[PDB]
Write a structure and sequence with these properties.
major facilitator superfamily, about 500 residues, mainly alpha, two-stranded antiparallel sheet, monomeric, Growth Hormone, Chain: A, globular, transport protein
Length: about 500
């Protein structure tokens, strides 16, 4: 049921928003508010879990709370895998965005209304399922707006993706402020209202602004496949029934078990995927060598995102427990604005730097190494003020976030490119998933590392992890020339 791209774009108004189609406005703010609600909710969710019950918190254990936050992004990734298949083969990107938005908004409401631990579980599940339908499909709709040959395409995405960091910056300052200063449920409420605005703009304007875009099923399911798909669901449901019948009476159906399962998948799944790509029948001898060459880059990426994603977990707790907020009075959630803030400012600087370097600029494997070196350094900087025994000055924590961003602008922008070059030709449609997998696997590993983070093990925690990144980064530099030459 795929429709001609020129015909799809023909149903879309071509102007009305900075020289771009009106649909860009619709998609920009739909994405903005969704990212706003998500990052706003995340900025206080960790605090909401381990804070005292008398302080409006859930009274959960600190290590359990931090572990839950860690697996959150990983679950979204796995959800995004499913949501991509659903939109491409069942719903279409427009319907997936709509349904996703509903589940997400319902997720926030479950936190906004008076509730407890059970409300948390329900909220996460709804948001995970909803985000999996929203996040990966919303980008496909903007692509449908631009006809083949329309040179405004790249600039269109650039404006679109700008909303992510914009939402990631504003939200902790709005949701975080209201949540921490006044009431947690109020902050959760503003997240719900935020997402609601996303649904409002989308639903009301999509018919006139987006037209045919996303309203079709790109790769529909044949009657034979539909019968085979339901057979999978029937079998899977039977398996899911057996598991519940085993775990529940044993008392093994807990969040601790689920975290462990995610952790195992964080190591097992990447291993299996590398074997598949290597032993795939359509992969040539040159491509197998490129698979081996991609292994250190995947490990480095995962190690990088391990440190980067801890800025919203371990470092979030650091701002709440080990940081002097009164320097007038800072909110611990405000530190979640630093990463998107520094990216917004430093990105044009970095882009200008690569051009000026020209042929002198570092290669892709070297940029991976540079990202890892900065990441490890950010943990070294962070352990220093504590070793020198009360609250540390917040300037050290800010500097820690800053150094991470320096590493991110080295590794991240070439991440997908590196994956595309070293992945086999047959796996071209899975290049994004493979690249995003490293970041996903990192967060799954992060949850297992949580228990090692204690005030007594603090210096060893930051030092070992940061030191491991420095060692790996140093090794990657050495083997970078060989890997760089294998690049297509």
């Amino acid at each position: 049921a795929s429709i001609d791209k020129q015909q799809i774009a023909a149903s879309v108004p071509q102007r009305g928003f900075f020289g771009h189609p009106k649909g860009l406005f619709t998609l920009f703010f739909t994405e903005f508010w969704e990212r706003f609600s998500y990052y706003g909710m995340r900025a206080i969710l960790v605090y909401y879990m381990y804070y005292e019950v008398s302080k409006g918190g859930l009274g959960l254990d600190e290590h359990l709370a931090l572990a839950i936050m860690s697996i959150y992004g990983a679950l979204v990734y796995m959800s995004g895998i499913i949501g991509g298949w659903l939109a491409d083969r069942v719903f279409g990107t427009s319907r997936a965005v709509f349904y996703g938005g509903l589940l997400i908004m319902a997720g926030h409401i479950a936190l906004a209304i008076p509730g407890g631990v059970a409300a948390l579980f329900v909220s996460m599940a709804l948001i995970v399922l909803g985000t999996g339908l929203l996040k990966p499909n919303v980008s496909s709709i903007v692509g449908d707006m631009y006809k083949p040959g329309d040179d405004r395409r790249d600039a269109g995405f650039s404006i679109f993706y700008m909303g992510i960091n914009l939402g990631a910056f504003l939200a902790p300052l709005v949701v975080g402020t209201a949540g921490m200063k006044y009431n947690f449920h109020l902050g959760f409420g503003l997240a719900a209202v935020g997402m609601f605005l996303g649904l409002v703009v989308f639903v009301a304007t999509r018919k006139k602004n987006l037209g045919l875009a996303g309203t079709y099923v790109p790769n529909p399911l044949t009657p034979a496949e539909k019968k085979k798909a339901a057979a999978i669901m029937a079998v899977g449901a039977v398996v899911i029934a057996v598991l519940l019948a085993i775990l529940i009476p044993n008392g093994w159906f807990t969040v601790e078990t689920f975290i462990s399962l995610v952790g195992i998948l964080g190591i097992i799944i990447p291993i299996i995927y590398f074997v598949v790509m290597y032993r795939s029948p359509k992969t040539t001898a040159e491509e197998r060598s490129r698979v081996i060459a991609y292994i250190p880059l995947f490990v480095a990426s995962a190690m990088f995102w391990a440190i980067q994603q801890q800025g919203s977990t371990i470092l979030a707790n650091y701002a709440d427990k080990r940081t002097q907020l009164d320097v007038i009075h800072l909110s611990p959630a405000w530190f979640q604005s630093l990463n998107p803030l520094f990216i917004i400012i430093l990105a044009p600087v970095f882009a200008w730097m690569w051009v000026k370097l020209g042929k002198r600029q570092p290669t892709i494997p070297q940029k991976f190494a540079l990202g890892l070196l900065f990441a490890g350094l950010s943990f070294i900087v962070i352990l220093v003020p504590g070793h020198l025994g009360g609250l540390v000055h917040p300037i050290w924590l800010v500097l820690s976030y800053f150094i991470v961003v320096l590493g991110e602008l080295c590794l991240s922008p070439v991440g997908l490119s590196a994956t595309t070059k070293l992945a086999p030709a047959a796996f071209s449609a899975q290049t994004m998933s493979l690249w995003f997998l490293s970041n996903a696997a990192a967060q799954a590993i992060n949850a297992q590392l949580v228990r090692f983070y204690t005030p007594e093990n603090e210096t060893a925690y930051f030092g070992t992890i940061g030191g491991a990144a420095l060692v790996l980064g140093l090794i990657l530099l050495a083997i970078a020339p060989r890997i760089g030459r294998l690049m297509k």
